Ligand binder design. Structure first.
Ligand SMILES: *[C@@H]1O[C@H](CO)[C@@H](O[C@@H]2O[C@H](CO)[C@@H](O[C@H]3O[C@H](CO)[C@@H](O)[C@H](O)[C@@H]3O)[C@H](O)[C@H]2NC(C)=O)[C@H](O)[C@H]1NC(C)=O
Ligand SMILES: *[C@@H]1O[C@H](CO)[C@@H](O[C@@H]2O[C@H](CO)[C@@H](O)[C@H](O)[C@H]2NC(C)=O)[C@H](O)[C@H]1NC(C)=O
Ligand SMILES: *C/C=C(C)/C=C\C=C(C)\C=C\C1=C(C)CCCC1(C)C
Ligand SMILES: CCCCCCCS[C@@H]1O[C@H](CO)[C@@H](O)[C@H](O)[C@H]1O
Ligand SMILES: CCCCCCCCCCCCCCCC(=O)O
Ligand SMILES: *C(=O)CCCCCCCCCCCCCCC
Ligand SMILES: *C(=O)CCCCCCCCCCCCCCC
Ligand SMILES: [Hg+2]
Ligand SMILES: [Hg+2]
Ligand SMILES: [Hg+2]
Ligand SMILES: [Zn+2]
Ligand SMILES: [Zn+2]
Ligand SMILES: [Zn+2]
Ligand SMILES: [Zn+2]
Length: 348
């Protein structure tokens, strides 16, 4: 056999030399050099050091500035929360696991590791479909007098958690399951064994269709809409109104956010589909370690894109960080927001 299937795992390594050992019971240094696990460990460490501050700061700024209440300000607050669950929820176990070369906490640690990374990536995916819509509704504007209230935003946000849970929670209760991958320091869905006892093959198709192919289609199609309408070609103050102008900006970002997602998840999803379609073949531990661990940057790139592509949020952050105010920068030239400063309501 090309690998070592276990009742709970599947090491992508032969046991012809009987050197293979349950990744819930002993180090896996026979799969790779010990320094490489240190790499994973060092890496998970730096990611937690970046992901915590960046996501918490994002979260703190959004709340403190009483005017940051657009559908986008919501979706990104949602993402910051989901990213903090990633950091504390599973990254703590993946660093702990990398440090020992195996899942000392056994399947429980594997479930934390798998669930939160899944929950996180899937909340991002669904939050992108919501943006695609909102994006659409504003650009190609379907109604002749409609506007997303905060309620809607909270709707979309609530929706992303139902959809993400629909995919991440099943494996914790008998449908498919989380199992260690690559150097066995991370945990994902089961694409390795057909384990009928927990109905793995069906869940995998359920996830690639309901939680992937489909949301992608929506998002892409929706784009093919904001193709003839709002385009990447973004000019200066007023595009037909400085209003319309700054509309082109949010869309440019929602589009970058999509590219960042694919870069981050296509390789993983790709290796994952392969394995599913080539169960038992001869792949090694590094095969999935690389995209699996690279995809964990998904807990941080969202806020970066946001702060770099949103003059208003960046300013509210500089305003916040600069303890007092003095949003130096160039401000937003347009609206601003905060708590006691110029968070002065100014609609109509
Ligand atoms: C790869 O081949 C190895 C040799 O066949 C095999 O080693 C076997 O590992 C088990 C661990 O479950 C040992 O069983 C021990 O189980 C408990 C320990 O808590 C006790 O009842 C005894 O101490 C018992 O020995 C086997 O002794 C051991 N057999 C050997 C070394 O020949 C690996 O498990 C195989 N890799 C896999 C499939 O994970
Ligand atoms: C172990 O892995 C090897 C290589 O991945 C598998 O060999 C392949 O077998 C398929 C048919 O199942 C052929 O289409 C390929 O051409 C084979 N490639 C090679 C390298 O010979 C092998 O099947 C696997 N063994 C199992 C079933 O555990
Ligand atoms: C490091 C831990 C990881 C990557 C744990 C598991 C992640 C998954 C099972 C992710 C699945 C998918 C996502 C988030 C994005 C769309 C494609 C997908 C279904 C492969
Ligand atoms: C960017 C998406 C990545 C898509 C995943 C490609 C899986 S490709 C697969 O990898 C194996 C490694 O053990 C090779 O042995 C095999 O020849 C190759 O076809
Ligand atoms: C089109 C691209 C959007 C891409 C954006 C950049 C935001 C990036 C952050 C990636 C996390 C890197 C972590 C280093 C840890 C060593
Ligand atoms: C105004 O004073 C100019 C901006 C300078 C602020 C320096 C930015 C340092 C970033 C550290 C913030 C970490 C957030 C805390 C998370 C717990
Ligand atoms: C509120 O306005 C304070 C700004 C918050 C960012 C923290 C800035 C730190 C100040 C610079 C410290 C220099 C480093 C010296 C190390 C010995
Ligand atoms: Hg769109
Ligand atoms: Hg990424
Ligand atoms: Hg602001
Ligand atoms: Zn079983
Ligand atoms: Zn989902
Ligand atoms: Zn199969
Ligand atoms: Zn500026």
């Amino acid at each position: 056999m090309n690998g070592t299937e276990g009742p709970n795992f599947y090491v992508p390594f032969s046991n012809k030399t009987g050197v293979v050992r349950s990744p819930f019971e002993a180090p896996q240094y026979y799969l790779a050099e010990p320094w490489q696990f240190s790499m994973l460990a060092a890496y998970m460490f730096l990611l937690i050091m970046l992901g915590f501050p960046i996501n918490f700061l994002t979260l703190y700024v959004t709340v403190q500035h009483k005017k940051l209440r657009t559908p986008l300000n919501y979706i990104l607050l949602n993402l910051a929360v989901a990213d903090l669950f990633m950091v504390f929820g599973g990254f703590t176990t993946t660093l702990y696991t990398s440090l020992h070369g195996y899942f000392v906490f056994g399947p429980t640690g594997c479930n934390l590791e798998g669930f939160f990374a899944t929950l996180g990536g899937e909340i991002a995916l669904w939050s992108l479909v919501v943006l695609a819509i909102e994006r659409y509704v504003v650009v190609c504007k379907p109604m002749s007098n409609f506007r997303f209230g905060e309620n809607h935003a909270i709707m979309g946000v609530a929706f992303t958690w139902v959809m993400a849970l629909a995919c991440a929670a099943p494996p914790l209760v008998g449908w498919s399951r989380y199992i260690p991958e690559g150097m066995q320091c991370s945990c994902g869905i089961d694409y390795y064994t057909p384990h009928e006892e927990t109905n793995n093959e069906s869940f995998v198709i359920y996830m690639f269709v309901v939680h992937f192919i489909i949301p992608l289609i929506v998002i892409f199609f929706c784009y093919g809409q904001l193709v003839f309408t709002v385009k990447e070609a973004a000019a200066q103050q007023q595009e037909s109104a400085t209003t319309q102008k700054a509309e082109k900006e949010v869309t440019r970002m929602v589009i970058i956010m999509v590219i960042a997602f694919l870069i981050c998840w296509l390789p993983y999803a790709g290796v994952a589909f392969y394995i599913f379609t080539h169960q038992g073949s001869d792949f090694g531990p590094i095969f999935m370690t690389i995209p699996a661990f690279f995809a964990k940057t998904s807990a941080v790139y969202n806020p970066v894109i946001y702060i770099m592509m949103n003059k208003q949020f960046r300013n509210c952050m500089v305003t916040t960080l600069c303890c007092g105010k003095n949003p130096l920068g160039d401000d937003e030239a347009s609206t601003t927001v905060s708590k006691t400063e110029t968070s002065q309501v100014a609609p109509a």
